Design a protein around this ligand. Sequence first.
Ligand SMILES: *[C@@H]1CC(=O)N(CC)C1=O
Ligand SMILES: [Cl-]
Ligand SMILES: [Cl-]
Ligand SMILES: [Cl-]
Ligand SMILES: [Cl-]
Ligand SMILES: [Cl-]
Ligand SMILES: [Cl-]
Ligand SMILES: [Cl-]
Ligand SMILES: [Cl-]
Ligand SMILES: [Cl-]
Ligand SMILES: [Cl-]
Ligand SMILES: [Cl-]
Ligand SMILES: [Cl-]
Ligand SMILES: [Cl-]
Ligand SMILES: [Cl-]
Ligand SMILES: [Cl-]
Ligand SMILES: [Cl-]
Ligand SMILES: [K+]
Ligand SMILES: [Mg+2]
Ligand SMILES: [Mg+2]
Lengths: 213, 204, 240, 238, 214, 225, 225, 228, 200
Amino acid sequence: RFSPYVFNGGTILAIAGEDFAIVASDTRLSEGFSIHTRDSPKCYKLTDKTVIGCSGFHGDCLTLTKIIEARLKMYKHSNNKAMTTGAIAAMLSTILYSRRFFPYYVYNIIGGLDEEGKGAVYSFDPVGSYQRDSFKAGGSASAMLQPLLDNQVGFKNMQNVEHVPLSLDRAMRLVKDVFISAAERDVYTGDALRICIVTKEGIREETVSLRKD
Amino acid sequence: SIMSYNGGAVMAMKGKNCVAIAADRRFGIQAQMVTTDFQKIFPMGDRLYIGLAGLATDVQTVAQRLKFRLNLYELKEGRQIKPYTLMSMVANLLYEKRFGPYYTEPVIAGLDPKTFKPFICSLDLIGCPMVTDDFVVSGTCAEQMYGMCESLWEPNMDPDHLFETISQAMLNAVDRDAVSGMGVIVHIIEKDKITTRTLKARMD
Amino acid sequence: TGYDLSASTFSPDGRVFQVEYAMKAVENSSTAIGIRCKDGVVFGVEKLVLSKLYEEGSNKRLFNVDRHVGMAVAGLLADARSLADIAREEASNFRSNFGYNIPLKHLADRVAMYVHAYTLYSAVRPFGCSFMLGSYSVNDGAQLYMIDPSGVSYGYWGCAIGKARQAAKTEIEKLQMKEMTCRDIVKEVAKIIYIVHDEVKDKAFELELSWVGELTNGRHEIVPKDIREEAEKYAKESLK
Amino acid sequence: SRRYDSRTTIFSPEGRLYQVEYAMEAIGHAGTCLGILANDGVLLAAERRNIHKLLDEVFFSEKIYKLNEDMACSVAGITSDANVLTNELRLIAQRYLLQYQEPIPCEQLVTALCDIKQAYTQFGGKRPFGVSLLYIGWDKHYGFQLYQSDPSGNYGGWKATCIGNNSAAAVSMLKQDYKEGEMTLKSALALAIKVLNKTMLSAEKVEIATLTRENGKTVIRVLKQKEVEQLIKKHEEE
Amino acid sequence: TQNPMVTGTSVLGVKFEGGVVIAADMLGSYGSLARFRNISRIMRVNNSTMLGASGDYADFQYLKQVLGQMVIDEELLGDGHSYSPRAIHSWLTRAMYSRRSKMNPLWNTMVIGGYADGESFLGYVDMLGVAYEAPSLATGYGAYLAQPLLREVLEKQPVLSQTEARDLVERCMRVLYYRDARSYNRFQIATVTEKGVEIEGPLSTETNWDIAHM
Amino acid sequence: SYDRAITVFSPDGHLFQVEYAQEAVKKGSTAVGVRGRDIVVLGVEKKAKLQDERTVRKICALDDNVCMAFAGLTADARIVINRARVECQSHRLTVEDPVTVEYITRYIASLKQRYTQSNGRRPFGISALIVGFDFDGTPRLYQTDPSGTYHAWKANAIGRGAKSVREFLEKNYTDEAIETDDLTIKLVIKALLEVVQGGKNIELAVMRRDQSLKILNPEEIEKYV
Amino acid sequence: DRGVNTFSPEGRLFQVEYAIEAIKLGSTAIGIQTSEGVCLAVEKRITSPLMEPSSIEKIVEIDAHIGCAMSGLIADAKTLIDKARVETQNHWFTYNETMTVESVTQAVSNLALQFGEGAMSRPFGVALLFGGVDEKGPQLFHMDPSGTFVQCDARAIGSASEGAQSSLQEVYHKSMTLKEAIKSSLIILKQVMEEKLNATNIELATVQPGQNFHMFTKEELEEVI
Amino acid sequence: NQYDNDVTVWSPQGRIHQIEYAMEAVKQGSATVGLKSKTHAVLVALKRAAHQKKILHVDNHIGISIAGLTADARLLCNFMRQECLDSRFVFDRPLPVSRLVSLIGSKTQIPTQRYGRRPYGVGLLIAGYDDMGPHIFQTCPSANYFDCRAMSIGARSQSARTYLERHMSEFMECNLNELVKHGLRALRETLPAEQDLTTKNVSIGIVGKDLEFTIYDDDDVSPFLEGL
Amino acid sequence: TTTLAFKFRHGVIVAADSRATAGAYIASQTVKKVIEINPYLLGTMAGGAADCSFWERLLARQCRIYELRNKERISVAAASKLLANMVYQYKGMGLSMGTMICGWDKRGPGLYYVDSEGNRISGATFSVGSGSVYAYGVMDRGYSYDLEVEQAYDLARRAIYQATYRDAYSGGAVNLYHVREDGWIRVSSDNVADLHEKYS
Ligand SMILES: *[C@@H]1CC(=O)N(CC)C1=O
Ligand SMILES: [Cl-]
Ligand SMILES: [Cl-]
Ligand SMILES: [Cl-]
Ligand SMILES: [Cl-]
Ligand SMILES: [Cl-]
Ligand SMILES: [Cl-]
Ligand SMILES: [Cl-]
Ligand SMILES: [Cl-]
Ligand SMILES: [Cl-]
Ligand SMILES: [Cl-]
Ligand SMILES: [Cl-]
Ligand SMILES: [Cl-]
Ligand SMILES: [Cl-]
Ligand SMILES: [Cl-]
Ligand SMILES: [Cl-]
Ligand SMILES: [Cl-]
Ligand SMILES: [K+]
Ligand SMILES: [Mg+2]
Ligand SMILES: [Mg+2]
């Protein structure tokens, strides 16, 4: 009996700032107890101000990103402008739902800037249920990442703390930390961490080394 | 068993220059009786009848769809259908549904509309025809009916003897079937008349 | 009133004028020739320069329809290009089904029957193009076929299509092509094109040359530029 | 091809449908056919256009068709077209009986066929059927009924009407002689002979069918040659 | 394919300075039976691209037919454009994903090796449309037995010469012969460089069985 | 199937087949509609002896709350009427409300319009007057024609001599004329008597607020004449 | 004799030529684009006092931010209006944003030329003015039966468009306010109309950056006159 | 007369009148010019209310200029866009320009041979850049296509073609600025003697070695006109 | 999930929790389960999140088209019927939807329950979701047609709160809406942790 799905691992994370958005992923591609490659990013640039993270079944990740890239150009041709972060999120909802009865085995997070230049994060289930988030972890180690973010970014369960705005510097340190911690416990997360920072200036990337085991 | 869902029994029997056809009257759904006057024998001409046992919905559908085709045939050809031709027409209707069949196994009883020669047959649910010179049975108590018919039937029975034989065969057969009975109707077809009787029967 | 509007209409004398009118479109085109020699087939085309703005190589009239099959065309070029696609698809399908390279004769027959299908109906019009198919292999040797708008297909030692067809044939008949190599033939093809070229009426032309033979290992290829230029110079000096 | 298309389903500049009108011309050259409603039944009277000596007469009728248990019809126009339409009428009647398990009311049968005829005048680019039909019948809604349909798919109910040859002359005679609400079958028969006498007399040249009710059941019968020869003799006395 | 029939085992690949080398044994297994012992599981696609296939051999022959015709089609045009290794890999990904999505997979795992624009290409495509690039690849049991040795060498020395990559591949083929019960001691090696695609074979490995006295 | 373009543009921007369809309407019997205060009235001219009057009627109910009159090809009319009847039921099914008079008008009009722009078909050769009441009890009268144009009217006429009847209604349609139910019916009869030269050859029907269509007897029409 | 997809020796599609002529049978519509918004004004052209003026709808809402004035064969326009309405809602559904005036015009014009040999047998005999507000500000577009569309500062369509366009080019300036534009188009409509302009025989609608598509009420029209 | 209504009817002289009539449609369009150097391909167009669009984006490496029926132009532009998307989807690389033009010719030929169909009444100038460098192609209602050093189509384009022939020997070696000015000068030849190129009537499209196909309109064309 | 709605004198109250789960994992505590179909119509999300969001967004699309075509706002009965007809075609294909369509039309306050099983029923009060049984208890004990506006708010808020207490799959915040004659309003959003402080 042929199965059309396999789990390929990967952890994705996005954080929305005042004037920035971060999308981060590990670079490991796995199957079973094996590693396919140590250099497989899960982040894809869509426009100058929008990045998408995708994890799950790698077959579906590849297909979906190629579909999105095509749809962006189609939209630009008929509407004479680039798609907004919000429009991409809305569109992806319909793309995912078009396969409601044979789903894309994919967890998606969109990170970028809204129309006011503010950070925007959108998270999706495999059939296109979605909402805007302040921050979100997806994929293999998401149950490991999410609680610390709730605590450190959301200030959950903390008394007598001033709810300061989140600086890029603190956000960058949090991203590195959660991934290093995930790399300790989740067998699927490791090798390297790829961080994409989206600001008005553009998208810049940073890479940090993770455990190779 | 799909054929036992509604229950039911029909038989036909050949006499000298006459035929008979009989049916139980129960309409039930598994154990539950619903009505006691369900029609299972339908006229297909002055001297030609079809009786259908099996799934009640299919009994009705086949009766109605066969009448459709027979009415068109009679209008086109300007004559009454011969019994053997009706059997073929029925066989054709049933076999069209070879891969999703009607759950009914009919019996035909009649006289040839010109020779008045007796004819009886039965068909399976996919329309394999079977012509006999004695009797045919169809329903959930086929074995009980075979036992009575084999024991009681004689050749060249007069209308009165034929009536008693098919009556006793049906009554005593259905009384050994939980899902058949609640009454018996009998039609005697002769050259000059049809005689229709309901029998005094157990109502359990 | 007229008997010449539809390919599904015979005239009282049993002609199909729409096919004849399509053949006229070929007769108005400039000349292409094919010559079958000892060890292959050579094609040459008088390609008229309609504008100096066009690139050298624009509106090719020589096509590869399979790795071993070349095609030379005359007539309405859009129709010719679509026939090149038909031929390509036919060669492709043959390999898929039968598992070897299509014999030239079979390809000619198949494409010709496609051409013919367009001569029967009011729903479609005949192709306004004639073409030559050329091939070489060790087993089959050199083969040259020509198909016209009616769908007729024959094999030739030498062939010409276009407006100077009769004048080209006269020159071709002077050759003992059976005994000659492709190297010699390219020069003769260049020569014949320069002879039949009406210099007064049509002003500027490019010579287009291709070949398939033992020297190309049964692959249809353009004649190398250096050999083409040598042939042009030979043809020019011969016309003295 | 637009060249060869005769465009059978278009309007003329006056808003006329030429093929329909030419079809009605065809019918006017067909055998005379009339129907008469009475209190105790309906009848059809037709001129036989098959009056050759070497004909066999193999059917019970030539121009009168049974449609179902409660209905018959007669036709004027192209015979072959009539065969198509009468077959279709039988199918519609049976389709209704299958669905409702009751006979189709007469007007419902007429409407259903007229919808087919109308379709041929509006789309499909085909020639219409060159047939007018007279329908006789009984139903539980309106009892004894007589209908007429023409090639466009128009129909109407009549107490008496005529189609085919000399139908204008026949409709005149009917207006004069037809006693509305007082007609029996015997007097309707008489009037039918009288009308066919003028518009056309022999028993071989006419065909008469009657529709009556007996014991809650419809009887459709084609009169035998003896009954028709006796009706012809009864008129000539008048 | 719902059910693979005749199948091939591991395919290996490694990038080196100026090209790529792939290897596959010449066996088609029918279950446990070594049935067809002289079949090629490597394909020259064009002058810059080669392809090796694990899994169903009938499905491989189909891809050879389709892809072979595709390259012929392109060469007919003679327009100076040619399918890059990356383009073949992309096409293959789409084809495999497409067949998977119809619940009618081509039952193959494939290694594409190429050299174009002074760049080595090595890509993986499986029957589900999972595709990626890596400095070394190994399908099947090769993933467990060969890939650890390949990645071990590439860790200490990322850039290999052609002879070093060839020695490393021969060592891995020896390991697979020792430890994979569907392998065979008869293999081909294909190399792509600036000069084009060469296919060498049949090749054999020398074996050591000293441990039989231990 | 047959795909010939039947309705096409001519020089000057004319759609000849539609104009010819409109000629078919003018050959039709006169039909008059008047919208009153709390009543809507339709009246039609009739063409005979020996004919059954019931069978050949030019006033037809589409739903319980909507009815229409027509002029032109009677066969085409039957097709449009039955299409509208189906649509009235589809609406009750999907929205659980009866159709508005405007909704069904819009449907009939768009059907007619489609037959002016579809291959292999000629236009419908009828105009229709559509009457009834809305949910809020507002009386309505609409007209459709072969082109698929529709408009609401206080009063209107279609068919033979529609132009004369229209000019009569323009001078006669006042508050005094539609003040009662009796005067509303009268105005329709007067409008018809202007072109029917008759009074015994007219069919008339009335529709009141949520009371369904009532066709008047010949004895009741003889009282007004 | 000749097909619907025939070219003239001058390289024009006959049917499209004839469809453009049919626009000249239509009543006059005017659109003006200002920095404060866009206004649309149309002559109703009442043909009878018995006809209800409010049942003549020549300005329609496409979405909250887009209106549409039409001229020509009005029945043809209904199918185009529906396509525009559906398309704006399709865009909202997919992208969760408003569709630009240009994009809507583009989508509608895709229908044109899609005729030939029960598909469309002929072009649509209508011209459209699309007026709305998006992120590019207020915008007016014109589309004709050929499927050509273009942005316009001020445009007139219909029978008296040539004269009205002359008037527009004289009065229009880029810094002109919306209140001026409303008055301008009403003055121009007044002079090109056959009947005397009043509050019942014209339609007027605006779309502003501030507020949604607004159809002027009877009382609002009286104020402007 | 009887030979000029159907695209399936050959005339006795071996011509198809419907195709020729379709070619007249492009002559009625406004002038457009295309030319190339060794690094760039440029489109320049005169625009005939806002001025009507003439230059359309197809892919990052391909743009087109149109002359003739606007509706046919968009139908063909959509086909072209789709072919480019398909190529990138399947092969993850741009569709070679010459391959796209072949696809256009094959597509536009089909209706020239089938009854009740008509030719595309549009001519295209196609500017592209691929592995074989910059390209200018021209497509015709006849479904024929041409590989051009430079070209002009539309009304009074004959005088633009005359300019181009005169100057084409220096096109290959021009930088981008000089190449655009050459295109503007050629287009200016089409204008009546009094009329001039303005920022309202000129549209420019450029694709090259390190530049995605970009369209310049209105204020964006000012830098190019200033140098003239 | 716990959602409820009830008609009363002053319109229809709609309330929901905000928790979404993937198995036992809490994926979100800030889901908007009250869906704004149009300014006069609300829907609710229970069952499959994508299924409700997609199909009700499709309803919003159809309702807007209807308004444009008919020049009148759609009734609650007709809107709920549209949705029921939409999903019926997909019975047995594994759609998971339980929704309440809430509005105010010509018939006054309107409230329909519609699900993917094919149910469509009008009613005075409904509760839908894993937590519905717990909300029914509280709502049924407190509900009256002649309830005051502030009393209606308190009851809806409390009923959802009590559901979040007992039902593992309900929690986060309680979101409350009020459908009035001139449209709906967002009344409040209270974190369950804040409500705990208040109620004890
Ligand atoms: C070649 C094809 C085309 O469109 N033209 C312009 C009329 C040509 O000269
Ligand atoms: Cl049947
Ligand atoms: Cl020739
Ligand atoms: Cl019957
Ligand atoms: Cl019957
Ligand atoms: Cl072997
Ligand atoms: Cl090979
Ligand atoms: Cl329709
Ligand atoms: Cl009229
Ligand atoms: Cl105009
Ligand atoms: Cl156009
Ligand atoms: Cl050309
Ligand atoms: Cl030109
Ligand atoms: Cl929330
Ligand atoms: Cl709707
Ligand atoms: Cl209910
Ligand atoms: Cl739930
Ligand atoms: K790890
Ligand atoms: Mg019993
Ligand atoms: Mg809880």
